[PDB]
Design an enzyme around this catalytic site. Structure first.
Site, PDB file in Angstrom:
ATOM      1  N   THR B  24    -109.334 -27.021  95.046  1.00  0.00           N
ATOM      2  CA  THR B  24    -108.308 -26.311  95.677  1.00  0.00           C
ATOM      3  C   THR B  24    -108.411 -24.792  95.120  1.00  0.00           C
ATOM      4  O   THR B  24    -108.327 -24.614  93.867  1.00  0.00           O
ATOM      5  CB  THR B  24    -106.749 -26.781  95.122  1.00  0.00           C
ATOM      6  OG1 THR B  24    -106.808 -28.029  95.921  1.00  0.00           O
ATOM      7  CG2 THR B  24    -105.849 -25.830  95.853  1.00  0.00           C
ATOM      8  N   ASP B  40    -107.585 -22.475 100.453  1.00  0.00           N
ATOM      9  CA  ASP B  40    -108.783 -23.222 101.165  1.00  0.00           C
ATOM     10  C   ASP B  40    -108.028 -24.291 101.692  1.00  0.00           C
ATOM     11  O   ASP B  40    -106.982 -24.844 101.778  1.00  0.00           O
ATOM     12  CB  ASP B  40    -109.737 -23.731 100.022  1.00  0.00           C
ATOM     13  CG  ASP B  40    -109.204 -25.108  99.264  1.00  0.00           C
ATOM     14  OD1 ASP B  40    -108.041 -25.014  98.724  1.00  0.00           O
ATOM     15  OD2 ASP B  40    -110.057 -25.983  99.301  1.00  0.00           O
ATOM     16  N   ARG B  42    -109.664 -27.664 102.151  1.00  0.00           N
ATOM     17  CA  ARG B  42    -110.431 -29.032 101.621  1.00  0.00           C
ATOM     18  C   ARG B  42    -109.630 -29.867 100.980  1.00  0.00           C
ATOM     19  O   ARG B  42    -108.964 -29.493 100.128  1.00  0.00           O
ATOM     20  CB  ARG B  42    -111.764 -28.841 100.947  1.00  0.00           C
ATOM     21  CG  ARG B  42    -112.393 -29.880 100.776  1.00  0.00           C
ATOM     22  CD  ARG B  42    -113.825 -29.822 100.638  1.00  0.00           C
ATOM     23  NE  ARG B  42    -114.465 -29.314  99.522  1.00  0.00           N
ATOM     24  CZ  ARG B  42    -115.780 -29.055  99.156  1.00  0.00           C
ATOM     25  NH1 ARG B  42    -116.718 -29.489 100.265  1.00  0.00           N
ATOM     26  NH2 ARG B  42    -116.069 -28.767  97.991  1.00  0.00           N
ATOM     27  N   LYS B  56    -102.579 -26.332 103.268  1.00  0.00           N
ATOM     28  CA  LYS B  56    -101.931 -26.121 102.108  1.00  0.00           C
ATOM     29  C   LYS B  56    -100.779 -24.892 102.018  1.00  0.00           C
ATOM     30  O   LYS B  56    -100.205 -24.780 100.917  1.00  0.00           O
ATOM     31  CB  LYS B  56    -103.039 -25.868 101.064  1.00  0.00           C
ATOM     32  CG  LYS B  56    -103.968 -27.081 101.003  1.00  0.00           C
ATOM     33  CD  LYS B  56    -105.147 -26.792  99.713  1.00  0.00           C
ATOM     34  CE  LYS B  56    -106.065 -27.798  99.838  1.00  0.00           C
ATOM     35  NZ  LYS B  56    -107.328 -27.564  98.880  1.00  0.00           N
ATOM     36  N   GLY B  70    -101.832 -29.817  91.532  1.00  0.00           N
ATOM     37  CA  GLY B  70    -101.389 -30.677  90.479  1.00  0.00           C
ATOM     38  C   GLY B  70    -101.199 -31.972  91.486  1.00  0.00           C
ATOM     39  O   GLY B  70    -101.893 -32.438  92.302  1.00  0.00           O
ATOM     40  N   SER B 152    -108.533 -25.446  90.872  1.00  0.00           N
ATOM     41  CA  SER B 152    -109.716 -25.424  89.976  1.00  0.00           C
ATOM     42  C   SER B 152    -110.731 -24.343  90.230  1.00  0.00           C
ATOM     43  O   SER B 152    -111.523 -24.093  89.679  1.00  0.00           O
ATOM     44  CB  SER B 152    -110.588 -26.909  90.574  1.00  0.00           C
ATOM     45  OG  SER B 152    -110.624 -26.949  91.731  1.00  0.00           O
ATOM     46  N   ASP B 189    -116.806 -23.221  93.629  1.00  0.00           N
ATOM     47  CA  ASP B 189    -116.452 -24.568  93.170  1.00  0.00           C
ATOM     48  C   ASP B 189    -116.276 -25.818  94.065  1.00  0.00           C
ATOM     49  O   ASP B 189    -116.337 -25.765  95.155  1.00  0.00           O
ATOM     50  CB  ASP B 189    -114.761 -24.109  92.829  1.00  0.00           C
ATOM     51  CG  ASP B 189    -113.969 -25.361  92.749  1.00  0.00           C
ATOM     52  OD1 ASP B 189    -114.227 -26.234  91.775  1.00  0.00           O
ATOM     53  OD2 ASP B 189    -112.948 -25.462  93.448  1.00  0.00           O
ATOM     54  N   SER B 192    -113.286 -26.627  96.438  1.00  0.00           N
ATOM     55  CA  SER B 192    -113.030 -25.699  97.373  1.00  0.00           C
ATOM     56  C   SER B 192    -113.949 -25.859  98.459  1.00  0.00           C
ATOM     57  O   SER B 192    -115.356 -25.851  98.122  1.00  0.00           O
ATOM     58  CB  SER B 192    -112.511 -24.204  96.887  1.00  0.00           C
ATOM     59  OG  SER B 192    -111.679 -24.589  95.753  1.00  0.00           O
TER      60      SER B 192
END
Lengths: 205, 215, 242, 241, 243, 250, 234, 143, 244
Positions: B24, B40, B42, B56, B70, B152, B189, B192
């Protein structure tokens, strides 16, 4: 502290001078080795001329400061401008009565007509100590000697500003949790003055 | 009343006797006349990609938006509860909701639960006092920032933001900067990926929600 | 007059009038009779004549089985009786759970009287307008037990007792026809005496008389035709007497 | 009059009235004092008549104007005990609002809160209404100058200008005539001293009497603060015009 | 009498409860409802208190309500107290289903509601419910059942019964022409004829009626409830010979 | 002892009538006239702003309140009771439905909640009954448009068109003369203005009349753009200028 | 006639500004028998005339020991006397247990006044209807207090309460200087008290059964004499 | 001046601590049938293995209100907390609705929760014994 | 219209004229009490009380009518004794709490407001009755001398001179004359003598009586509340007797 909570690795100073008081701090917030905020305002206003800085758990100190500001508004509606001693007492009661669940330390700097500017410190545990000047935070440990060698009573405004700047610059130099800009508030009979100094200024002291 | 504590002892006992209890990139950027939030799209249940197009960006109020990380259920529940409270308060006061009011409600609610509600949020918005951006931690601490990252992939996004941020940004510049930070999080990352969602809140205008701004 | 508007007020002659008024409410109910035999207890009740369009399949009986060995009859307000019966059944099961032994008749009578007394201990409640007759056997003994309970919380033990409307006439008949030294030595004699007592105040006893017989070892039998047979036998004996 | 239980407690009479509420309204006028409120371009002014006939009474301790918060001021019509009770309640409500929602309480929301409390008093059998009329004045950051009024019945409403007391009808008619003459719904002066002088002269014209420096009380609400004028300021305003 | 009626917790010198009697008398101010139990179903028919043509007849929730898929009620009295009690009864039926995995018998639900109504006559801060209920239901223990409950908390079982404004005349008419072997159609006709004869208006128009049946024959022994719509009510009125 | 209870403030009379409910109805009949009429594609709810002072601001006080984006209400009777009920109704709409099903309640269910509260007000030893009557208009997906009347006893009924207040009977007669099954929302607004014309005894303009409608969705009032499935509010309050425009014309 | 309208409870004033239920509670004191208290400088004495129901009954206890340095006599309502004596005992026990301190007599008077004043201003209860005399010895010497259940306490050298107590009070007031100087001689003080309580006797004589005495002193703990122990004082 | 609830644990236990469900046969023992808890729940089991947050959540609002009352006493005087508590007591006492559990409007107005929602409101929170009006009547009246 | 029938049997009831009759009956109870006066001098306050002569059995030093609320606050009252004692206890509690919390003696207006709120709270419910005392209290704070009078309704004001009790009318007349004759002000000793004179003038009710005088001044008593000593008290009594 609680697991995963946000701690306050700050550098806090409060110095009494001839015309009043000056409260200064750095502006770094960390999550271990990562800087989560390069520019945070650590100077908390509790009343018009009663300011404070916080250490320990960030959430607990924010909740305590909000309750204290509520308390001082309630006091002001009844009796007017509160003394720095009253704010220190409210801070102390809140920190001491909840010390088994909340981690909190406060430095309170105030000005009023009767007492002409005062500094109080409330370390972890909830005891209160009234001082001519106070230092706190992770970086403060590196400037205990220097301050003890360079403080005089009844200094001018410029001398106090320079003293705080030098001390906080050393604290930033040696402590890894202390950061970029130096923020200060001057409380006198004239009013509230805000000052900021950048790394290119104080790193060349 | 409220969240229940029943079957806590039973669940602990099952955990002790080998019964596995099932389980994320987000940025916010202020510009000269408003604030942008981007994320993002995903959604993964572990290493498996559950959904390639996940929304999101969540709406606290028409001009106050937020995104979270979280525990997902906690984030959604807290956002919806604060949205209900904000709507009721706005009806009561006959005024447009303020971002500081939502900040206070979220902070006090998260502090009440002593960090056991795992909600980490970025909240952006515009109200009659101006534009506001805030970060909110699970234990009840909040902070103010001109540009913030979360998730992340927050370090890559923060690197991009630190590379290309200025005091005076136009709407287009801010949108491009936020999209670039989300793209860096996507590329560098593993958590994401996929598309980018954007929401632009400008002072004096309706909030503009651009889903799949860059696919 | 002037001292009757609360349950906590003593009149100058040391009376509490609301208790007497609850007794007046009891007086309006259908008559209930209990007769203690040598080895059984018979509870008889008067049923108001049913209407043409009234369903008799699921009509509640005037005699309620509190436990396997204890039965209850009442006079007064029906719904209050339902509340008392529910509480009594719950208490019987609670005692059986707590002490492993089923209640005795006197224990259940004392509990019911305690509930009735409790409902007279506040100005915000209304006392039950019910008088009750509790019959049975202690669950190891052959001694019959018959008790009467009143709205004020008072209970007593009787060999034969009548409550409700026109109860004075039935009480006079029982006093003139019941001998404590020689109680009815058979179930048939006790049932016949109960039916003849109920016939003193009932217009048509074939359809307005209910009889329940309780014997030791928790038997409890409710009579049907049998009541009509007893009524016809009584009538034929009277006709032969004349 | 009141016949039955609707003479101790607030319940409906056969005509659908609540007599205790009307009697509290009657109590509101027992002080025999008039109050006036007018809002200017960027300020609000409240004037209350000051009657201290007794020579043994200290004038400086007689006041019906209160500072509820930094921005909100209040004027009360009615007995001073209920006035002080309501003043403390309003202070607590404003501070609690600031603590809970993160921004200062506006005047109309406070008026609505007090009106809801009064509604509680009008519906509960074991609570009595306060026999006072409350008038809150401020300069709200979203609405500009604002005057709101609440009554024992639980009714609250906002005003362009207002007056309350035994002689309120004359002052209201004079204000309506002036507003029909001007047709701006407020006062066009930009300095609060001019608005204060206008309100003093309006009160003098409406009551048909001359005011000294000790027969008046003045409160002024600006953008940043609400304050109360002392005797010297009132005397200076009178000397000016 | 006037000295012993201000509270529900005081007996009169004759042992009377005046508030309960007044609550019982308040039922006569409501519309008539009739329940008839035939050999293969139950019929509920109620007369609306409609006095204006601007009322919404299609939205028909005034007299007839469903507690679950097998029990229905006809209401006579205050509708708000009725709604409170009906929601309580629905919750109780769902609780019984949850606990025992079986449908709640009709008598248990009736007794629960009657106990609630009696309890509301025994506390000084509660006034009695000003409602009367006609319960029509089916269960595996007794088959088809018809019950009535009043504000005092008493309940009774019936083969045919009426509650409301014209109980005496309707009861006489039902007594004259009720047979134990009637079918559901005959019960429907009898209910309509009784309402038509007892109505105080001019003619028994369709918009003044509520109708419901509980029958068997959807697929099997399973029992289905049919709440008649205004069109179906008009069709039945035409078919009977009333129009 | 004697403070753990309080006797019931509302009791039956020997005739069988609850006196406090009847007196609350009497207070309702002394209130300013309000009305509501349902069309085939909307509902109109109207009332009079009977200001007790010329110096008062009519914009500050509003007798028509949004309950949900698709449900609004008006009242006749005592204002503070209505305001308390409106706050409670909004809170209940969020607590019982929105936080459970993710949707706003239908009109009938919110009406039922308000009616339950009003009924509970009449079974108490601490409070008197509410002294208001409410007209609640709304729209929902599976029921279309709806209009309900809620009385102080807690009874509620659905109406095609109705009125409450001082001139309720004459307004009902007029509406029953004017209502039909093919009416439109604009026709309903015109009929509402005509009905309110015969009850207002003073200035009859856009500054003394408060009117609101339940019609089609208003995307311009949503406050944001980007979600095609997000429908705007159906409830809309007409401005004073719009009322003036409708009054000047036919 | 008009007093009958404004005497329902302690929550009601009359139009003339009187609180009648407290007045009736004060009148309830004269229904009790006579008690006398006095003290000079080192000892304090209480004398009580006790009453019995009939010939076959015992005599009522009128003197109750609160602590080894403090005691009281009662005249009036009996339940109130029991309640107040138990309350004073509890207060003395609390003082001794928490501070290792003897409770002062003035402190006890203040506590009794505080407890009594509350029943005169709140609905649901009833004012107390018993008067008390409290004797004690503490660091400030010998103390005698008179407690009136309206919530009043007075400090005095000697007094009497109960029925026909005026004669004893007049005798005590007339001979103040004689008994105020009896220091170090308990017997003379007890005799003076017995004579004073004899002044109030009417058609009665002090016997060994109807007389009770109590004394507290410097080195003398609070002691009660009844029965033959008072025969020496007649 | 507390923030987190304190002093939540019980300092002593007894078998008759719950006066509502005391057995009639043995008054010193509780009545397990009328408890309707499942029949196998000793009181001692409630003294161990609790969630550390349950006590904090249960007593949170009371603790905040007690802190508010203490602040009023410090700043205003005794009369302000006295009046607030008196109002709350009067509102709570004169409400007896055995068929509903929802809080009153006036209580929420006094608590300043007119337009505030918490999980207690969203989740307000069958039996053979003790689910009737009469049990609540007895509990309310102390019969 | 001093008796309102139908509206005087409950505490928190309004009459059709908007009056509360129980509070007025408590005022009637106050009006039948002992006369008590308070005079505000240049830098302090003086309280004076007329007291009936009791028996010699009472201890002379334990019979004081002028209560000391605090080291700088004195108080007298007229009405029901237990109510006045309770109110003085509450005042002492409030003063102690304020001094503990804020490290300074409580200002007189704040103390007056706390007392007034407590008194007013007793006119709100039917389960209590209003206090039957009117209280004259005063003291010295950082802003100077303050003198207040508090009523059973909870209404209180600051006064140049206050009087209550049976002889309130004559006392008020003499206080007004004293204020008129001294527009500049009045010293502490002059206030003591004039208070003695006023009590003696108003004592005519018939009957032996005693005079009790206390004062609190910045120059004389260093801002502390003290009773007037024997010599000054005797001088005041002699001057009052010579005036009559």
């Amino acid at each position: 502290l609680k697991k995963g909570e946000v701690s306050l690795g700050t550098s806090i100073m409060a110095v009494t001078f001839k015309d009043g008081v000056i409260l200064g701090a750095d502006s770094r917030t960390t999550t271990g080795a990562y800087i989560a905020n390069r520019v945070t305002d650590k100077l908390t206003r509790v009343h018009d001329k009663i300011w404070c800085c916080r250490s320990g758990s960030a959430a607990d100190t924010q909740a305590i400061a909000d309750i204290v500001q509520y308390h001082l508004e309630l006091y002001t509606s009844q009796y007017g401008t509160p003394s720095t001693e009253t704010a220190a007492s409210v801070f102390k009661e809140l920190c001491y009565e909840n010390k088994d669940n909340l981690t909190a330390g406060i430095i309170v700097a105030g000005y009023d007509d009767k007492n002409k500017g005062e500094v109080y410190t409330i370390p972890l545990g909830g005891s209160v100590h009234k001082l001519p000047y106070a230092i706190a935070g992770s970086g403060s440990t590196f400037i205990y000697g220097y301050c003890d060698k360079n403080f005089r009573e009844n200094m001018s405004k410029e001398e106090t500003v320079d003293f705080i700047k030098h001390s906080l610059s050393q604290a930033i130099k040696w402590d890894g949790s202390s950061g970029g800009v130096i923020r200060m508030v001057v409380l006198t009979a004239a009013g509230v003055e805000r000052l900021i100094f950048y790394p290119d200024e104080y790193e060349q002291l | 009343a409220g969240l229940s504590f029943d079957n806590y002892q039973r669940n602990n006992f099952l955990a002790e006797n080998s019964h596995t209890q099932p389980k994320t990139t987000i940025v916010g950027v202020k510009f000269n006349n408003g604030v942008v939030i981007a994320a993002d799209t995903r959604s993964t249940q572990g290493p498996i990609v559950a959904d390639k197009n996940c929304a999101k960006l969540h709406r606290i109020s028409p001009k106050i938006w937020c995104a979270g990380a979280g525990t997902a259920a906690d984030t959604e529940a807290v956002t919806q509860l604060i949205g209900s409270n904000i709507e009721l308060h706005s009806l009561y006061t006959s005024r447009e909701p303020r971002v500081v009011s939502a900040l206070q409600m979220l902070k006090q609610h998260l502090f009440k639960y002593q960090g056991h509600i795992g909600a980490y949020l970025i909240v952006a918005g515009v109200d009659p006092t101006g534009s506001h951006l805030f970060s909110i931690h699970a234990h009840g601490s909040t902070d103010v920032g001109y540009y913030l990252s979360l998730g992340s992939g927050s370090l890559a996004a923060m690197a991009v933001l630190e590379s290309h941020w200025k005091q005076d940004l136009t709407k287009e510049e801010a949108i491009k900067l936020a999209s670039d930070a989300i793209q860096a999080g996507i590329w560098n990352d593993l958590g994401s990926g996929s598309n980018v969602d954007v929401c632009v809140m400008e002072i004096g205008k309706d909030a503009e929600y651009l889903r799949n701004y860059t696919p | 007059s002037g001292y009757d508007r609360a349950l906590s007020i003593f009149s100058p002659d040391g009376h509490i009038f609301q208790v007497e008024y609850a007794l007046e409410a009891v007086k309006r109910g259908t008559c209930a009779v209990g007769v203690k035999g040598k080895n059984c207890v018979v509870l008889g009740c008067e049923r108001r004549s049913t209407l043409k369009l009234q369903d008799t399949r699921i009509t509640p009986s005037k005699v309620s089985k509190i436990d396997s060995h204890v039965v209850l009859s009442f006079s007064g307000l029906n719904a209050d009786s339902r509340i008392l019966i529910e509480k009594a059944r719950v208490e019987a099961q609670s005692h059986r759970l707590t002490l492993e032994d089923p209640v005795t008749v006197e224990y259940l009578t004392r509990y019911v009287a305690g509930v009735q007394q409790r409902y007279t201990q506040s100005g915000g409640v209304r006392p039950f307008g019910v008088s009750t007759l509790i019959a049975g056997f202690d669950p190891r003994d052959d001694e019959p037990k018959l008790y009467q309970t009143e709205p004020s919380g008072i209970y007593s033990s009787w060999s034969a007792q009548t409550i409700g409307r026109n109860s004075k006439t039935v009480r006079e008949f029982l006093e003139k026809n019941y001998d404590r030294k020689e109680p009815p030595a058979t179930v048939e004699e006790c049932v016949k005496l109960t039916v003849r007592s109920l016939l003193e105040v009932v217009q048509t006893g074939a359809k307005n008389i209910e009889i329940t017989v309780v014997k030791p070892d928790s038997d409890i039998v409710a009579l049907s035709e049998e009541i009509n047979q007893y009524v016809t036998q009584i009538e034929q004996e009277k006709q032969e007497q004349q | 009059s009141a016949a039955g239980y609707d003479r101790h407690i607030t319940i409906f009479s056969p005509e659908g009235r609540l007599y205790q509420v009307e009697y509290a309204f009657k109590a509101t006028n027992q002080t025999n004092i008039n109050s006036l409120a007018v809002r200017g371009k960027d300020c609000t002014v409240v004037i209350s008549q000051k009657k201290v006939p007794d020579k043994l009474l200290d004038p400086t301790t007689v006041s019906y104007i209160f500072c509820i918060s930094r921005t909100i001021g209040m004027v009360v019509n009615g007995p001073i005990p209920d006035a002080r009770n309501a003043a403390l309640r309003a202070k607590a409500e404003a501070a609690e609002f600031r603590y809970k929602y993160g921004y200062d309480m506006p005047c109309d929301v406070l008026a609505k809160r007090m009106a809801n409390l009064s509604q509680i008093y009008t519906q509960r059998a074991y609570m009595r209404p306060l026999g006072v009329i409350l008038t809150f004045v401020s300069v709200d950051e979203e609405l500009g100058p604002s005057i709101y009024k609440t009554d024992p019945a639980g009714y609250y409403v906002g005003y362009k200008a207002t007056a309350t007391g035994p002689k309120q009808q004359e002052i209201t008619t004079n204000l309506e005539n002036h507003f029909k003459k001007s047709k701006i719904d407020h006062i066009n002066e930009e300095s609060w001293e001019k608005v204060v002088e206008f309100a003093i002269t309006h009160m003098i014209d409406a009551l048909g009497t001359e005011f000294s420096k000790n027969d008046l009380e003045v409160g002024v609400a600006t953008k940043d603060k609400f304050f109360t004028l002392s005797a010297e300021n009132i005397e200076e305003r009178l000397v000016a015009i | 009498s006037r000295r012993y009626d201000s509270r529900t917790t005081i007996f009169s010198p004759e042992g009377r409860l005046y508030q309960v009697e007044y609550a019982l008398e308040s039922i006569s101010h409501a519309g008539t409802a009739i329940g008839i139990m035939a050999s293969d179903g139950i019929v509920l028919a109620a007369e609306r208190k409609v006095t204006s043509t601007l009322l919404e007849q299609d939205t028909s929730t005034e007299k007839l309500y469903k507690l679950n898929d097998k029990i229905a009620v006809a209401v006579a009295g205050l509708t708000a107290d009725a709604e409170i009690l009906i929601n309580t009864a629905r919750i109780h039926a769902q609780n019984y289903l949850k606990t025992y995995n079986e449908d709640i018998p009709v008598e248990i639900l009736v007794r629960r509601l009657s106990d609630i109504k009696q309890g509301y006559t025994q506390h000084g801060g509660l006034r009695p419910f000003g409602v009367s209920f006609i319960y029509a239901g089916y269960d595996d223990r007794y088959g088809y059942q018809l019950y009535t409950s009043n504000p005092s908390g008493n309940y009774t079982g019936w083969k045919a019964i009426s509650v409301g404004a014209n109980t005496s005349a309707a009861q006489t008419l039902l007594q004259m022409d009720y047979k134990d072997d009637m079918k559901v159609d005959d019960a429907i006709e009898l209910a309509l004829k009784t309402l038509s004869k007892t109505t105080d208006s001019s003619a028994l128009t369709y918009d003044r009626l509520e109708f419901a049946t509980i029958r068997k024959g959807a697929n099997d022994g399973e029992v289905y409830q049919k709440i008649f719509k205004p069109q179906e009510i008009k069709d039945i009125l035409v078919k009977t010979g009333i129009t | 002892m004697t403070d753990r209870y309080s006797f019931s403030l509302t009791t039956f009379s020997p005739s069988g009538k609850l006196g406090q409910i009847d007196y609350a109805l009497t207070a309702v009949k002394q209130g300013v006239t309000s009305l509501g009429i349902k069309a085939t594609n909307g509902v109109v709810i109207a009332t009079e702003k009977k200001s007790s002072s010329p110096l008062a601001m009519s914009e500050t006080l509003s007798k028509v309140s949004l309950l949900t984006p698709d449900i609004g209400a008006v009242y006749s009777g005592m204002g503070p009771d209505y305001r308390v009920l409106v706050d409670k109704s909004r809170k209940v709409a969020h607590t019982s439905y929105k936080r459970i099903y993710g949707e706003y309640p239908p009109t009938k269910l919110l009406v039922s909640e308000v009616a339950k509260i009003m009924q509970e007000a009449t079974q108490s030893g601490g409070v008197r009954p509410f002294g208001v009557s409410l007209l609640i208009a709304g729209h929902d997906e599976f029921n279309g448009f709806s209009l309900y009347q809620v009385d102080p006893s807690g009874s509620y009924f659905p109406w095609k068109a109705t009125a409450i207040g001082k001139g309720s009977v004459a307004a009902k007669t007029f509406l029953e003369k004017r209502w039909n099954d093919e009416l439109e929302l604009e026709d309903a607004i015109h009929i509402a203005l005509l009905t309110l014309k015969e009850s207002v005894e003073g200035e009859f303009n856009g500054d003394t009349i408060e009117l609101a409608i339940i019609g089609d969705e208003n995307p311009d009032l949503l406050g944001y753009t980007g979600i095609p499935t997000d429908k705007g509010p159906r409830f809309r309050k007409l401005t004073s200028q719009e009322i003036n425009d409708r009054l000047e014309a036919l | 006639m008009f007093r009958n309208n404004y005497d329902g409870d302690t929550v009601t004033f009359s139009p003339t500004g009187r609180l009648f239920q407290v007045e009736y509670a004060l009148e309830a004191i004269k229904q009790g028998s006579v008690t006398v208290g006095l003290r000079s400088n080192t000892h304090a004495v209480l004398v009580a005339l006790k009453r019995n129901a009939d010939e076959l009954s015992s005599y009522q206890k009128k003197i109750i020991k609160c602590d080894e340095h403090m005691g009281l006599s009662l005249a009036g309502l009996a339940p109130d006397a029991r309640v107040l004596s138990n309350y004073l005992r509890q207060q003395c026990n609390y003082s001794s247990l928490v501070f290792n301190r003897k409770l002062a007599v003035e402190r006890a008077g203040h506590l009794l006044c505080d407890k009594a004043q509350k029943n005169t201003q709140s609905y649901g209860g009833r004012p107390y209807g018993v008067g008390l005399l409290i004797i004690g010895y503490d660091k400030s010497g010998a103390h005698l207090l008179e407690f009136q259940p309206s919530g009043n306490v007075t400090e005095l050298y000697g007094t009497a309460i109960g029925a026909r107590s005026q004669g004893a009070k007049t005798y005590l007031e007339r001979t103040l200087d004689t008994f105020i100087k009896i220091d170090g001689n308990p017997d003379e003080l007890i005799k003076a008290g017995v004579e004073a309580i004899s002044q109030s006797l009417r058609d009665e004589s002090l016997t060994v059964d109807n007389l009770s005495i109590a004394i507290v002193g410097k080195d003398t703990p609070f002691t009660i004499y009844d029965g033959e122990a008072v025969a020496k004082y007649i | 001046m507390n923030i987190v609830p304190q002093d939540t644990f019980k300092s002593q236990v007894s078998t008759d601590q719950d006066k509502s469900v005391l057995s009639s046969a043995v008054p010193s023992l509780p009545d397990t049938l009328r408890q309707q808890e499942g029949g196998a729940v000793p009181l001692s089991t409630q003294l161990n293995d609790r969630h550390p947050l349950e006590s904090t959540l249960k007593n949170w609002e009371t603790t905040q209100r007690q802190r508010q009352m203490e602040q009023y006493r410090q700043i205003f005087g005794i009369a302000e907390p006295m009046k607030r508590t008196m109002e709350m007591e009067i509102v709570n006492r004169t409400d007896f609705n055995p068929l509903s559990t929802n809080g009153s409007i006036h209580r929420d107005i006094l608590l300043n929760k007119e337009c505030s929602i918490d999980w207690e409101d969203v989740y307000p929170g069958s039996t053979m014994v003790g689910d009737d009006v009469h049990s609540k009547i007895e509990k309310q009246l102390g019969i | 219209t001093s008796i309102g029938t139908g509206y005087d049997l409950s505490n928190s009831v309004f009459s059709p004229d908007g009056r509360n009759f129980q509070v007025e009956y408590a005022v009637k109870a106050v009006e039948n009490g002992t006369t008590s006066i308070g005079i505000k001098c240049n830098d302090g306050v003086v309280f004076a009380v007329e007291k009936l002569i009791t028996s010699k059995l009472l201890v002379p030093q334990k019979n004081v009518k002028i209560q000391v609320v605090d080291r700088h606050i004195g108080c007298v009252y007229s009405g029901l004794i237990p109510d006045g004692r309770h109110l003085v206890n509450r005042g002492r509690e409030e003063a102690a709490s304020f001094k503990k919390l804020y490290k300074t003696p409580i200002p007189i207006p704040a103390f007056a407001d706390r007392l007034g709120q407590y008194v007013q709270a007793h006119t709100l419910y039917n389960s209590v009755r209003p206090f039957g005392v009117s209280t004259i209290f005063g003291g010295v704070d950082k802003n100077g001398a303050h003198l207040y009078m508090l009523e059973p309704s909870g209404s209180y004001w600051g006064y140049k001179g206050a009087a209550t009790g049976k002889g309130r009318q004559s006392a008020k007349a003499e206080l007004e004359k004293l204020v008129d004759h001294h527009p500049e002000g009045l010293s502490a000793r002059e206030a003591v003598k004039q208070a003695a004179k006023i009590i003696y003038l108003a004592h005519e009710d018939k009957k032996d009586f005693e005079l009790e005088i206390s004062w609190c001044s910045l120059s004389e008593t260093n801002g502390l509340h003290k009773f007037v000593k024997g010599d000054l008290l005797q001088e005041a009594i002699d001057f009052a007797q010579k005036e009559i």
